[PDB]
Amino acid sequence: LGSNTHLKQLIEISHLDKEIDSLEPLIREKRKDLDKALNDKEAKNKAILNLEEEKLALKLQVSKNEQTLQDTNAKIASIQKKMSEIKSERELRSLNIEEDIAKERSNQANREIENLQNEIKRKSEKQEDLKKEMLELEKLALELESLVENEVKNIKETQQIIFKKKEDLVEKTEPKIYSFYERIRRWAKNTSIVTIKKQACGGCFIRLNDKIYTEVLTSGDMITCPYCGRILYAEGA
Ligand SMILES: [Mg+2]
Ligand SMILES: [Zn+2]
């Protein structure tokens, strides 16, 4: 089926595969502060541009309010002109009140415009803030980058050395045995070879029946789990 020396050979290889893989989180850890700075800087850059779209919409409102304020003031002017020419003096008190409503609407527009302009200003202040933060983050990225990339390069060279060792080991392995390993590794990755714990597959955790548990411990072969297909071994048999 396999044989214990073939099992040994695959255990050595599978450990070198795990080494190559488990160094991937290491590269990520090494980059964490640097990637954080770069990603925060990009997020703040987007926030500046978003705030610019909001300032644009607000500036459109300022302009719309400004047109109605122009209309309102023309109406005031027109009411006052009518008061000058008058007619009688029924309407002097009447027009004073017409004018008063129009004055109030013009006071509302002036307040609304001032309010919008205030919101615009707060956004421009926030933009200046973000811009300063972006520069601190660039300063940060530039500091971290020299070492981080050297550290990562040294780690890559280690994965190559590990792979070179794998080549040497694979070259000494019965091609059929290796391929049986690789076929399972396609889907199972680094849970390809597992130990028995309790009486269950160390990979799918479903209890192995008496016949199979005995077979793994007693016989000098290499057995696969009947539920998931993984290679199984007793840590010492
Ligand atoms: Mg008056
Ligand atoms: Zn299993």
Q: Using what technique was this structure determined?
A: X-ray
Ligand in nearest proximity to the CA of 204 = 2
Give 235's contacts (C-beta < 8 A, 6+ positions apart): 195
| C-alpha dihedral sign at 90, 96, 99, 100 | negative
Classify residue 224 by burial, with Cβ atoms within 10 Å: 0-12, 13-18, 19+.
middle
Nearest CA to 156 among 34, 35, 24? 24
What residues pair up with 200 in beta bridges, in sequence order? Answer: 197, 207
What residues pair up with 21 in beta bridges, in sequence order? Answer: none
* 69 CA to centre of ligand 1 in angstroms: 19
* 78 CA to centre of ligand 1 in angstroms: 14
Ligand in nearest proximity to the CA of 76 = 1
Ligand in nearest proximity to the CA of 103 = 1
Nearest CA to 162 among 154, 173, 172? 154
Ligand in nearest proximity to the CA of 99 = 1
Nearest CA to 159 among 13, 12, 7, 16? 16
* 26 CA to centre of ligand 2 in angstroms: 29
* 79 CA to centre of ligand 2 in angstroms: 92
* 204 CA to centre of ligand 2 in angstroms: 4
Longest Cα–Cα distance in the chain:
123
How far is 196 from 234, CA to CA, in rounded Å? Answer: 6
* 7 CA to centre of ligand 2 in angstroms: 17
Residue with tokens 């050595």: 12
Q: What is the resolution of this structure in A?
A: 2.2
How far is 21 from 25, CA to CA, in rounded Å? Answer: 8
Residue 197 DSSP symbol:
B
Annotate 56-68 with DSSP letters as a single string.
HHHHHHHHHHHHH
* 84 CA to centre of ligand 1 in angstroms: 13
* 96 CA to centre of ligand 1 in angstroms: 6
193-195 sheet: strands from edge to edge: 193-195, 231-233, 223-224
- The CATH number given to 1-237 is 1.10.287.1490
How far is 140 from 41, CA to CA, in rounded Å? Answer: 10
Domain ranges for the chain, please list them.
1-237
Residue with tokens 């411990």: 217
* Cα distances (angstroms) measured from residue 173 to each of 2, 8, 13, 19, 34: 12, 10, 10, 19, 42
* H-run or E-run covering 11: helix 4-22
Ligand in nearest proximity to the CA of 208 = 2
Q: How distant is the alpha carbon of residue 155 from its chain centre?
A: 24
How far is 9 from 173, CA to CA, in rounded Å? Answer: 7
Helices vs strands, H then E, count in the chain: 5, 3
SS3 201: coil
Give φ, ψ of 194 to 5 degrees. -130, 150
